[PDB]
Amino acid sequence: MKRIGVLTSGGDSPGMNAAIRSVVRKAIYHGVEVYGVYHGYAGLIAGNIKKLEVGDVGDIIHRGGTILYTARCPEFKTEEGQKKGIEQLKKHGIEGLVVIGGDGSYQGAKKLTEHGFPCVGVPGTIDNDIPGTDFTIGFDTALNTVIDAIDKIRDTATSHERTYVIEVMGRHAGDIALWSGLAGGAETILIPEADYDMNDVIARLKRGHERGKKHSIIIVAEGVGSGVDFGRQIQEATGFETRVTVLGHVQRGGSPTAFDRVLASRLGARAVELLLEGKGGRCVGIQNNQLVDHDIAEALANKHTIDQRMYALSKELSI
Amino acid sequence: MKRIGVLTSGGDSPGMNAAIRSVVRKAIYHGVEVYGVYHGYAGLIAGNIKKLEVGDVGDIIHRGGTILYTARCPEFKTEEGQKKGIEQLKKHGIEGLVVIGGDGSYQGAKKLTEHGFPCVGVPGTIDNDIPGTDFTIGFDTALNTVIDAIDKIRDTATSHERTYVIEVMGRHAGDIALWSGLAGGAETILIPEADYDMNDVIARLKRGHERGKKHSIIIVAEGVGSGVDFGRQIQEATGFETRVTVLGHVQRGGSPTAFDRVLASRLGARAVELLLEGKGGRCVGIQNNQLVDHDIAEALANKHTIDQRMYALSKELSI
Amino acid sequence: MKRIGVLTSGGDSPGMNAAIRSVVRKAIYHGVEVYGVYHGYAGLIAGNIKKLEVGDVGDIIHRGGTILYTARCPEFKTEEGQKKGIEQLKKHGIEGLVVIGGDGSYQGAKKLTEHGFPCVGVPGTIDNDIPGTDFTIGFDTALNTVIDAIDKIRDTATSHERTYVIEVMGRHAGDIALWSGLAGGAETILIPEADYDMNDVIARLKRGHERGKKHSIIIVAEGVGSGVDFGRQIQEATGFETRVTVLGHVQRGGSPTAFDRVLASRLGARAVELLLEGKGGRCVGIQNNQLVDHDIAEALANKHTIDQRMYALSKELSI
Amino acid sequence: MKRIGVLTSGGDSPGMNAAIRSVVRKAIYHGVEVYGVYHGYAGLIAGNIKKLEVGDVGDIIHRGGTILYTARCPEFKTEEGQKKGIEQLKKHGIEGLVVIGGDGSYQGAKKLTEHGFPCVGVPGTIDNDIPGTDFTIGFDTALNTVIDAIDKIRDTATSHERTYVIEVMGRHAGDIALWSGLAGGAETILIPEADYDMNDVIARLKRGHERGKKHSIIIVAEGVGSGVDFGRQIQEATGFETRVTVLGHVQRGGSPTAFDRVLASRLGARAVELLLEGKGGRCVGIQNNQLVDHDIAEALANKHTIDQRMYALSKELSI
């Protein structure tokens, strides 16, 4: 392989620039030229391709976001879309692609390898719901942004303001809510996967108030419901003043923690090793503390699941 | 004075433990005994008073919250409530009191100076709307919590998610929104002291989008309205995906910055100084970079105002 | 059982309060009383044992250090020290003990296990060199503390001050230096387990300066030598102004990150589980992302190793 | 004025990008063209000047360092250096210059104005010793970097490791040590402006140890001496294990706090107004909470002073 490309697709997340750096530096280390593709699959179709040199990934390791930008491109689902993209790859002499992003970025990688363009997928998301990896690049940074908010709520010492509702991200996966709730000492953790009883939530809240819990912290994933309406429901039902924090898109940004930059460096460099040794159609991951790589179609057929032992542990510690 | 008391009241804010510590240590340096009054005015009525030693304020300097707690006391706004407070102060033989808190705790300080009890008021609130001081203890830390959220939102590198609405605290004052917005590069800052046209808000947004401005960040103070409703309305009028963050009670917590710890230290030390030279009925502050002290009643007659030049400057630098 | 005890020993590490919290809450959930032992093995011999209630571990999950304190007990190496240790457990009614700490704390757990006192050892140390676990409680926090300082040094934008030596902890193990340096983009990592050529350190440095590398960050494990001394030799040899940072005990403190609180919570609950099922003389750990428990004497036989692929990859990405 | 230039010189410091951003946006708002001078005075002599558009200062407000770089320039102390400087300025058509940096950059701004080149100096440095301003841009951020290290040291819960020596920057000025020590609760602060007695340091060290003081933190400004040497002597004289942290160049970097971004925004826009309103040869600053502007040569003969009440206050609160 003489010339490869790299691109980021889907929501951006902390650690995409450390994955771009390790892709670019490992490929240049073994004599290969790396072209950055700007604006995901939308810029692949448009021809927004520019050589990357060694020095262009200098000082991006510690930066959030992605310097190659991201964009939604529903035209890449279709056969017309893929042929316009391949024409731009052929025009610049790019023989392989490293694709950093979520589930939808892996669908394009699979379709490109079936049209003769070897591609590897690197899991870039804060949700943790990319199959074939225990941890996605960005998940550890998002947990550290939620627990910063939770620790600051722990300093309040106002007698009549003891009941806090924090709404975190997690439209389909409850990984951010569950690991944050456990790490934050949340009393009630509402995740998409588990069904909850509002009577159980109220009961526990009253039980903690009677034994003098200083703060009662409730975490709601955005996929279950809004914190605001949960907060009005708890105050109405109990008469405890309830404060709501809605973090929103703060969970996506920030300088990456040490675990996401080690992980993005390992995974980005492994994807270049896969392209250099003939393997295309695969996605890298970390499963059982080992660098692993799976065929994309096989990896995408598995479902995301949360650890149920961790969810039961979060209620036992919170009494 | 043989014995003084110290109390915290109103919304807790970062630096209150640094203010309690300089009260304690400054009083003990000059041979005075210091009594902590727990739960604000509510515990003063209750007789929840307790001797504090040198080592009791050790390792609190860098902590958010208040170690003496804060609470609401509706009974202290009546003559009977103020008479029971005095009774407990005379019962412990506390001859003077340092009150740390907002506007509402200043009113109780006033009222106890009228009944023969020397009181000094120390400005502890994150709002910055306490008359007679440029800066309140907790204002600087609450600005750093808000710009931490704004900085994380600036790392998103997604083309379709460009409009961000952040709701900060400050019911009647616009200082947290004005200083946060200037520090974070906000395009539009909505504070209670200025008038906004929704039409000009939209018009700045479209101007910036046309130039290629990467992010459009709108700060909304809570006394203007809700970020949720503004985001809804911005989205509807423009068609731009709008993301809303509501920090809420995160802005009151956290470890105090360097400025809040120095300011609390100086201000609490000055409060003990005034009491030991027989002044009572006063409140300390920092006005024109100098430690100042004012009659509470004359201090509470002034009206809090924001800096129009600084508000003018935030529109010229956000082009 | 009916009564269990918990102790912290060795250098303290962030996450030790989270481990204690999950020890106490997990035993109380199952109906077991938990008694805390102050000052490690010195206070076990001394008699410093006090019952811990549910609310006694409240608001400690997010703090660094350990609330049970830690101490050095030379006496506990002797048979007489062990026999006075068991005297006090038996006088207080304690039938088993959870021990949180390093290498040294595990030896004591072996010795008490061997005299009929069921003990379980929990890995608390910032170093990462406790056999039978991939990660020790405190390791993740210490990595983020070192990368916070390296990120700040990456902002210096002066061209005559491009060479920085950072000296991190790790007497015997180079985990902190290896993970820190891959995560902070260090050019040269000096760890105890790998051999270096000083002249190869000089050649890389020179090479990087020829291409226009902005910074040259060298991480030095404290086991290898002084950062001061290494910085003096780089200046002498190349003539490049060299600046040195010695973090020291900064690396041991701070609020534990999200991974350290999840790891402490899960490992501390696993330790109580083993005591309740009758196992004694075990040490918990996380190996291949799975909770494992090993015999302490079997565990202490292994040698700590660092990943050589991660060391080679660190040299490949810093070109 | 139709075209102005901006340049940063001297050690960099947090908030330099916020001052560059307010220089460029403020000039563009009043229809002026802004050219950036890369590498301080060294790139001024070389003609390393390039136009900056409105969007080239987008996303730098929250970043440390300077995007125009700083470089020592020995040639600009000579008249031909200066005349080459003016030749390049006339060649690009630059009419005025904003110089952001320390004392040394003020020297060149004075000589440029003496050959009829309107220059305004903006105080960028972490040390706080630029005359004419109470606060330099960068000083607030460096104080917060020193208290993050002191805060982490207060978590260690070891009884034999109680005495800690932190060496901070400040060759000629004690501002960083005095404000960090007071904010950190340092027991002994050694700054250039006060005379210390090493017997008085040892006696107050033993007093606190006797009473039960958890920690004994000593701050040493770098201009008084080394932290390592001080550590040796403390342990030699007392016998107490003494741990040293040398922060070094970590104090110059990092994302600027809220006070440094607000200060850089107001000061940099006030520099642009001064050029436009025909007053060159001046330096801006903040004195008694008000934007002031002083002639460069008058400002430069004023001496740097520290508040001695604040120094005395730091020994009174530390008992």
XYZ file of C-alpha atoms in Angstrom, chain C residues 6-281:
276
model
C -11.255 -2.648 56.852
C -7.847 -0.991 56.757
C -5.725 1.052 54.327
C -1.926 0.729 54.196
C 1.069 1.843 52.119
C 1.353 5.139 50.245
C -2.252 6.311 49.861
C -3.862 6.642 46.500
C -6.876 8.286 45.025
C -9.792 5.826 45.056
C -9.034 4.391 48.488
C -12.101 6.256 49.912
C -14.276 4.770 47.128
C -12.977 1.247 48.044
C -13.806 1.774 51.747
C -17.310 3.057 50.825
C -18.083 -0.066 48.771
C -16.609 -2.334 51.521
C -18.930 -0.816 54.199
C -22.078 -0.539 52.012
C -21.713 -4.072 50.597
C -21.310 -5.651 54.047
C -24.244 -3.630 55.586
C -26.463 -4.688 52.572
C -25.882 -8.363 53.491
C -26.276 -7.695 57.265
C -22.618 -7.523 58.317
C -21.151 -4.879 60.653
C -17.995 -3.126 59.405
C -15.430 -1.686 61.825
C -12.737 0.697 60.545
C -9.101 0.356 61.510
C -7.284 3.610 61.758
C -3.644 4.021 60.814
C -3.124 0.748 58.909
C -1.378 -2.031 60.855
C 0.053 0.442 63.453
C -3.489 1.192 64.624
C -4.546 -2.494 64.352
C -1.766 -3.294 66.884
C -2.637 -0.029 68.734
C -6.391 -0.814 69.215
C -7.683 2.094 67.047
C -10.869 0.326 65.777
C -14.218 2.154 65.555
C -17.563 0.971 64.130
C -18.523 2.479 60.742
C -22.204 3.145 59.998
C -23.916 3.615 56.583
C -23.605 7.417 56.670
C -19.955 7.295 57.868
C -18.773 6.649 54.270
C -21.152 9.334 52.834
C -19.556 12.111 50.762
C -16.125 10.373 50.547
C -16.465 8.712 47.073
C -15.012 11.754 45.235
C -12.177 12.544 47.702
C -8.520 11.578 47.519
C -6.525 10.164 50.415
C -8.091 7.738 52.861
C -10.286 8.579 55.895
C -8.956 5.585 57.903
C -5.405 6.991 57.490
C -2.309 4.999 56.639
C 0.862 4.300 58.602
C 4.163 2.491 58.698
C 4.334 -0.441 61.092
C 7.734 -2.148 61.255
C 6.417 -4.162 64.258
C 3.988 -6.192 62.041
C 6.919 -7.975 60.321
C 7.653 -9.649 63.735
C 5.570 -12.565 65.186
C 4.820 -10.527 68.336
C 3.283 -7.708 66.199
C 1.029 -10.240 64.394
C -0.065 -11.717 67.777
C -0.900 -8.230 69.171
C -2.745 -7.561 65.818
C -4.985 -10.650 66.285
C -5.511 -9.814 70.022
C -7.430 -6.593 69.100
C -9.462 -8.142 66.209
C -10.619 -10.912 68.560
C -11.336 -8.387 71.429
C -13.529 -6.261 69.108
C -15.339 -9.290 67.611
C -13.972 -8.909 64.071
C -13.916 -12.147 62.113
C -12.332 -11.070 58.792
C -10.393 -8.147 57.324
C -10.341 -6.208 54.036
C -6.874 -4.713 53.415
C -6.459 -1.924 50.803
C -2.901 -1.033 49.834
C 0.278 -2.266 48.186
C 2.843 -5.062 48.243
C 3.595 -4.470 51.942
C -0.118 -4.623 52.931
C -0.466 -8.049 51.140
C 2.364 -9.610 53.230
C 0.450 -8.685 56.390
C -2.699 -10.246 54.799
C -0.707 -13.470 54.103
C 0.591 -13.544 57.716
C -2.881 -12.972 59.273
C -4.401 -15.564 56.806
C -1.761 -18.086 57.976
C -2.726 -17.570 61.730
C -6.432 -18.307 61.007
C -7.616 -14.761 60.261
C -9.411 -14.595 56.932
C -8.129 -11.504 55.093
C -8.642 -10.294 51.496
C -6.178 -7.847 49.846
C -7.382 -5.003 47.559
C -4.991 -3.262 45.195
C -4.538 0.424 46.116
C -1.477 2.156 44.704
C -0.664 4.719 41.960
C 2.280 2.722 40.527
C 0.397 -0.220 39.032
C 2.784 -2.840 40.409
C 0.652 -5.164 42.438
C 0.607 -8.632 40.898
C -2.621 -10.299 39.871
C -4.340 -7.223 38.482
C -3.870 -5.233 35.301
C -4.738 -1.917 37.023
C -4.391 -0.824 40.635
C -6.704 1.677 42.270
C -5.045 5.066 41.847
C -3.159 4.438 38.603
C -5.742 6.132 36.333
C -5.819 9.314 38.541
C -2.003 9.557 38.561
C -1.922 9.265 34.732
C -4.380 12.229 34.367
C -2.301 14.258 36.931
C 0.845 13.750 34.753
C -0.923 14.557 31.458
C -2.440 17.717 32.976
C 1.177 18.978 33.464
C 2.360 17.796 29.990
C -0.582 19.543 28.263
C 0.401 22.866 29.941
C 4.046 22.472 28.747
C 2.674 21.885 25.192
C 1.226 25.506 25.207
C 4.659 27.133 25.627
C 5.145 28.804 22.232
C 8.786 29.887 22.580
C 11.374 28.578 20.062
C 14.475 28.682 22.320
C 12.739 26.642 25.039
C 11.657 23.464 23.208
C 13.180 20.684 25.439
C 11.342 19.545 28.574
C 12.197 16.755 31.007
C 9.349 15.613 33.257
C 10.164 13.347 36.220
C 7.258 11.102 37.251
C 6.965 8.506 40.059
C 7.572 4.770 39.833
C 10.548 3.399 41.769
C 10.399 -0.112 40.269
C 7.604 -0.021 37.685
C 7.477 2.191 34.603
C 3.665 2.061 33.993
C 3.105 5.720 34.989
C 5.960 6.878 32.703
C 4.984 4.534 29.788
C 1.252 5.334 29.778
C 1.804 9.045 30.514
C 4.305 9.415 27.682
C 2.189 7.626 25.036
C -0.798 9.772 26.121
C 1.184 13.065 26.291
C 3.165 12.376 23.088
C 6.585 12.203 24.787
C 9.462 11.561 22.410
C 11.582 9.617 24.933
C 10.346 7.557 27.871
C 12.916 6.297 30.408
C 11.538 3.392 32.406
C 13.294 0.907 34.720
C 12.372 -2.220 32.662
C 13.865 -1.080 29.320
C 17.383 -0.082 28.462
C 18.194 3.206 26.811
C 21.134 4.662 24.968
C 21.834 8.282 26.064
C 23.306 8.984 22.584
C 20.087 7.531 21.008
C 18.092 9.982 23.229
C 20.386 12.764 21.842
C 19.970 11.559 18.170
C 16.129 11.574 18.246
C 16.063 15.009 19.872
C 18.394 16.340 17.107
C 16.273 14.662 14.382
C 13.017 16.121 15.761
C 14.570 19.647 15.893
C 15.738 19.263 12.191
C 12.128 18.660 10.956
C 10.662 21.470 13.113
C 9.212 19.521 16.025
C 7.572 22.098 18.273
C 8.438 20.393 21.595
C 10.688 17.620 22.858
C 9.118 16.116 25.936
C 11.172 13.523 27.847
C 9.501 11.498 30.654
C 11.877 10.021 33.293
C 10.656 7.396 35.766
C 12.083 8.127 39.224
C 13.658 4.608 39.393
C 16.072 5.451 36.496
C 17.414 8.713 37.817
C 16.783 12.354 38.561
C 15.035 14.557 36.008
C 17.302 17.440 37.149
C 20.407 15.351 36.385
C 19.029 14.129 32.976
C 18.103 17.703 31.984
C 21.613 18.927 32.879
C 23.148 16.199 30.593
C 20.834 17.006 27.610
C 21.750 20.694 27.885
C 25.509 19.889 28.094
C 25.453 17.383 25.227
C 23.233 19.272 22.744
C 23.314 22.861 23.958
C 19.489 23.023 23.849
C 17.904 24.905 26.735
C 16.383 22.220 28.876
C 13.581 22.746 31.415
C 12.713 20.245 34.154
C 9.466 19.565 36.084
C 9.540 17.278 39.172
C 5.949 16.459 40.111
C 6.691 14.546 43.339
C 3.700 13.887 45.676
C 1.154 15.804 43.449
C 0.741 12.393 41.668
C -0.615 10.701 44.861
C -3.401 13.172 45.661
C -6.431 14.579 43.899
C -9.968 13.431 43.308
C -10.086 9.992 41.749
C -11.166 9.722 38.120
C -14.214 7.737 36.852
C -12.181 4.542 36.182
C -10.639 4.629 39.710
C -14.088 4.962 41.369
C -15.622 2.094 39.308
C -12.588 -0.096 39.898
C -12.521 0.613 43.672
C -16.288 0.097 43.995
C -16.249 -3.246 42.129
C -13.051 -4.609 43.828
C -14.145 -3.601 47.367
C -17.533 -5.354 46.825
C -15.707 -8.467 45.439
C -13.504 -8.533 48.611
C -16.636 -8.612 50.935
C -18.145 -11.335 48.709
C -15.039 -13.576 49.168
C -15.084 -13.058 52.998
C -18.856 -13.936 53.066
C -18.395 -17.099 50.949
C -15.578 -18.334 53.275
C -12.567 -17.677 51.020
C -9.736 -16.050 53.019
C -6.090 -15.394 51.957
